[PDB]
Amino acid sequence: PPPVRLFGVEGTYATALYQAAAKNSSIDAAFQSLQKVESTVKKNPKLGHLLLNPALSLKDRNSVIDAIVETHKNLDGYVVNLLKVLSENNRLGCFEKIASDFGVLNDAHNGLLKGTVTSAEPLDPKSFKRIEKALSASKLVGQGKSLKLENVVKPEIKGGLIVELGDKTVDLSISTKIQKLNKVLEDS
Amino acid sequence: TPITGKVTAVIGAIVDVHFEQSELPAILNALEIKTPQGKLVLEVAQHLGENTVRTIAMDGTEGLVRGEKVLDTGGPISVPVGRETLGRIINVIGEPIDERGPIKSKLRKPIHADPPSFAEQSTSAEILETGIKVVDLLAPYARGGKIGLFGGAGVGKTVFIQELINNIAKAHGGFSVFTGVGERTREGNDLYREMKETGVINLEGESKVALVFGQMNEPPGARARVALTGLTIAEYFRDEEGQDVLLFIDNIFRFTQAGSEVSALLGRIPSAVGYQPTLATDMGLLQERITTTKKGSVTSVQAVYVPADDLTDPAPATTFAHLDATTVLSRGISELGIYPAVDPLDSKSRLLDAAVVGQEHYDVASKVQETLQTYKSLQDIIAILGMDELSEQDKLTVERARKIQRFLSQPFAVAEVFTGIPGKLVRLKDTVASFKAVLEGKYDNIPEHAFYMVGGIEDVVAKAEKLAAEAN
Amino acid sequence: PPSFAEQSTSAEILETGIKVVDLLAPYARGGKIGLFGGAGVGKTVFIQELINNIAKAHGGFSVFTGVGERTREGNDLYREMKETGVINLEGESKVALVFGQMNEPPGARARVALTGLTIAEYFRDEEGQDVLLFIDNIFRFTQAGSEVSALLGRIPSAVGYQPTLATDMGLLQERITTTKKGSVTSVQAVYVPADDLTDPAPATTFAHLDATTVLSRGISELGIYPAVDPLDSKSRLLD
Amino acid sequence: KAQPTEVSSILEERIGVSDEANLNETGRVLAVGDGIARVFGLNNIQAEELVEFSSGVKGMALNLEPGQVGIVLFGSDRLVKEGELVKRTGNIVDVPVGPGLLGRVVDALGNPIDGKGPIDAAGRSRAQVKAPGILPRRSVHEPVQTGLKAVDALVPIGRGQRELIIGDRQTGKTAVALDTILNQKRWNNGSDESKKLYCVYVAVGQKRSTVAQLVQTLEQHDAMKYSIIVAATASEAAPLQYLAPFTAASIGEWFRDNGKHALIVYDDLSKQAVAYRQLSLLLRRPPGREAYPGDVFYLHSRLLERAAKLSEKEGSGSLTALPVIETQGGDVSAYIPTNVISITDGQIFLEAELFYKGIRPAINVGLSVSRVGSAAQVKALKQVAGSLKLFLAQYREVAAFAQFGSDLDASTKQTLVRGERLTQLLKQNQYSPLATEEQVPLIYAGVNGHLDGIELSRIGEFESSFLSYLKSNHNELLTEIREKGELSKELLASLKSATESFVAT
Amino acid sequence: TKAQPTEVSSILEERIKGVSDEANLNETGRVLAVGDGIARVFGLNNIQAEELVEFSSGVKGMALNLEPGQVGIVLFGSDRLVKEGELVKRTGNIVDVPVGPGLLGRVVDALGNPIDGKGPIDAAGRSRAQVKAPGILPRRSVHEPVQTGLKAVDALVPIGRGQRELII
Amino acid sequence: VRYEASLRQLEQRQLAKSVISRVQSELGNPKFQEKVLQQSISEIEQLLSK
């Protein structure tokens, strides 16, 4: 019984890392180790990201893994061997993707159903809050699970708002309605 | 226990089933999925790893959702067999689509069985007289052998098969299986009309034929297995009953084409021309189950479509290796109104030996092929210069050969609606003596047109009398 | 392209001015014309005479489009068109020129035709005229489209042409039509590739040409101006 | 007026859908190049489901993958942009069907392009419907009177008999089915629906001007009240041209399953094969012979199998199909036609040289044949044309034989003269269909050698002269042929006298 | 760049554990991908090129392509009885055949198995499949004829004991 | 009747450029501001349906 699929390409490292780690939980600890190692990649951005290049070596890649485990107890559990394999497999560059994806799987386990409330201009907090609770208590979320929510600014839309989550959306905005306004009048 | 699978990929008639249970069903087993249209059948093609297989559809795959529940049936597609299947119109799955109730058989055997081994082989020289002139002269048909109808687009193949069935299947005594593979639905309906009206199908009484169909409308995975369905039914009566089984296949090229269309979607590198790499192997596994054992006798006739009249296509060239008696239909011979349009040269037989057909038959056919080869050699000089620039021996030979060509054509009872002419069931020995007297030139006085579309040599005499009394 | 409702439902005859064209292979007002024949037969003289005959007769203008035109020959063409007066450098030149030269990447040469198309579409749909689009060569345009599809890594189709060949043609043809505002009549030269008519590029072009015009050598051999073969130049509107 | 704003504002009320606009489909577009688009998400999408992009262009999701789904476009990719929102319809691709489709001119999706407002549809029907099985069929037994001379003489057509019209470029192909539709005006003006026969013309990949003139011409002769035009012109996308004949086939199935009789005309399947190989090569699928994917036989197969004669259990509906194949230089051995010949129930070959000789229709009788047409020929025509095909093949035998200038006997020269008269007989101008009662006496004169003394050039005026002669005088015999469709011996002798009367001039 | 071939979910999982099971498989291998008589089999580091192998079903196969991830093995029977992850035993043999005098009259397969049903096969030795052709020095120019019995064959294109001759 | 249908089509295209005029009327509004609350109450209505 796997979680929500990462669907093949290069999430399969993260997929195997989860489903082999999770057989004995520790995925919060493995998760925090992943957060910490992506942090120390980010905390040393010069040649933490600039040294995920493929043209180095096998040996020097393994030594960069040694520098990662050299930084205190940055790695913990399977995630070093993960890197041992990753280093050997030289898929280190697509490591950022793995991180974010494990985060998605993890907060799916928590049930944070990330949403969005697209607009062409940011809005007041009262609207945020009222919408937030709306979806939260809506059949969408079955409760027992959270509900983030992000307003974004979109100029490509002419205003209004659109709610999004669980590949399920509602647009009541302006742009689409103008469109429907032009379509209906486009007949004889 | 149900081994539940999940739909992960849908590409045409090729679908991918993931499992979480590690007990994956083996190759060539039958999966099924409850559709709102009922059920749908899949066949296990290949383990792709990751507890996930790739399968071929037996039906159109429209309106399917990734993650739909997939149910396993354990084994391959078992087909009902036996005398219950007589006179029943059976789907590739094994569904009676005559709506005359379910086929209440005893046994349902899976289609993917092994071919008979080398020790189980049996040889025979039992010449089948067909009544057809060019067959009984130039390429005799072996009872228990395999018979090919190599033909281009619509040059009389299905008509020739119906002529063979009308000539043979009543005077057969054993049983018969027709299998319409990729053909016209109207052709299958009209054949069913005939089988009722000939009484070969007796609807309330007992029939002797079994109908396995599935036509060019059907998706290719259905077309890739219907031949195996009719095959399993035929070899059951060959083995369980030990009878004489007439297996009529139309069209065997549609099978290899169904093997071609999915192979690009089955992840294979495309092979030669556009066909699949597993051409000769699948052709072999199909043909080697079509044989005559010590237990029973299978006389099979298979139409072969030729793509765009290219005999160097790999599919009919592969098919030549599996056949005992070739019969090739040219469009150009049909354009001379010569029906049937059998090429007199290119037809062959493992039969036609002087110690088999008789010495005189062999000699007559030898001289006929020599004469027609001489004519075909002189054809280009005829095209440029004409018959005037010949030598007189060559001119006499061309005259006699062109008499022979019109004499080859034979009126069909099946194609009577194209002719208005009654069919001619011409006996063998009369045909031999007829071609004997023609090679002897006893009728060189008779013009060429009196040879056209005729029965025996007595009918040539009658038609020459009619032309003498009418053209005057 | 203009909609199906905007199609003028009956092609009248574009009166050119030339006796043989108006007699034997009449041109549709807003139609397609396959001009054959190599150079040296006064083909440029023929098309300049067409320019002047449209300018005097109907008053619509001409847009010439050299896709893959030889730059030396484009220069000689431009110099002649100055000298024959259809281009007046100070007064009213009666024609607009677009020359996609041969030394331009195939991305240019698969768009030079659409440039000249849009220019002609303006003078149709703004001025309400009958504007003549002259294209050489449609076959070099087909080569350009096939090379563009090749460089994009698309699998090539038949003959080595692009797989989008019918669509790449139809995006050019159906933007050339007779509106109710006016029409764009297009004359375009056709090189027959290696003298074959089952070649899909002339077999595609012939699925759009309503009228043909053949500049034979034998007619020019007899000192006849123009060099029109009477027998081969045929129309679908000779009815 | 404002009544369009009234109707559009009622449609604005529908635009009620926003109050229940919780689509379980929306997903981002991964990539979209070369007439295709990979879309992430859509985890409850169906196979061959219609979707619609955010730029209004619809599409069919054709191949499903773990991770994405490849959706073909139904238009130019210039409108679709990467990263957008792809709502699914919830439906396998369906088209409007119904009686109000008559007269209208639509796209591949039933969206009308005539500018005549919406479509009175009686329902929606899937595109890839299964062809009916062998049991709800019947062998054809009802004629299709095309109005042409040699067509109705030599190659009769049953209601549902799948007959190919094959020819070359600009060879009078379109005019054949056009005048067939124009002949159907006789019974579409009538009242018996089983006598009626409804016409669907499918112009794909062609010029919009050509289709406009065709629709114009069908309005001039007033065929439009029973006509349905499906336009898939060359400017439009290749999947539209791929898709449209299936939609028109669903329309023909709507008419057939109502018990009615209907005619569909495909023009042409050749460009549909071009569009389909354009799709498959942009699907990166390997081609086969002549760069076509190997399923292109299955394509036109699965198209044309949805056209037959229903049995009385189904209400005796029928659907007759007229495909058109443009070949290359009279070739009948290219990969595309040899497939179609293996599907259809017969051929109508148009020789380029006969039309080059102006013989319109340019029918090569020696190649053109039908298989089961004789079972549903008009019984009078079946009586009077038995020797006719035999005599024309006979004249064809002495056609190439007489080119050497050698003199011959009176028998073969007799066949030569009478076959010249029959050859110059069967010409027929466009938009000039002939009823069966009109076609019978010309055949009866042509068989019995009466044309032989008439000049070869005089035959064309002789035809109209003898027709106006009979319509003036032996109008009772015309009604007898109309009512019976079968000539008795008394009708035969009265016909003989009525012929030989005007044969005296 | 592109998904590699040793990246399936059932194989990386074990490598994450630190069990390192890929080194244990030297004389055996698991079936990753069986299909079309073709077995991508993981393991078998001590396999040889053109080596006969056996499956747990009982069908035998040949290793041809030695990819660093897995072994390509073609099959001398149907893949009807082979599943994913089935145990793969290494035979230890380059593909050899029994040879000897008692083969005369008998009818066998490629592998010397008597398909004639006349009992088993009395061999003398066993020989490799891809035996190297003889060199230049241990050769004789062909002079001993071959009696074909055909007229124009013996007359025009005579056959000697040692040459090769194509019937095309 | 031909000119009647022509006048209907001219009326329709003049109302199409009037649709352009209506869009330009709709563009400069604090309906841009107010209509956010429209979406607010709306999405409340849609998600409270389930």
Ligand SMILES: Nc1ncnc2c1ncn2[C@@H]1O[C@H](COP(=O)(O)OP(=O)(O)OP(=O)(O)O)[C@@H](O)[C@H]1O
């Ligand atoms: N009976 C006839 N009377 C008058 N003209 C005819 C007749 N038959 C054919 N034609 C002429 O043949 C020409 C071609 O017509 P049609 O479009 O049917 O040919 P086609 O081969 O279908 O061409 P395309 O395939 O490009 O449509 C027309 O210009 C028409 O005038």
Ligand SMILES: Nc1ncnc2c1ncn2[C@@H]1O[C@H](COP(=O)(O)OP(=O)(O)O)[C@@H](O)[C@H]1O
């Ligand atoms: N004896 C005959 N006389 C005249 N025509 C014939 C005869 N036999 C067959 N034909 C022609 O051959 C065609 C049958 O094509 P066929 O090859 O049977 O179809 P398929 O390709 O489906 O097998 C018919 O059109 C028919 O006219």
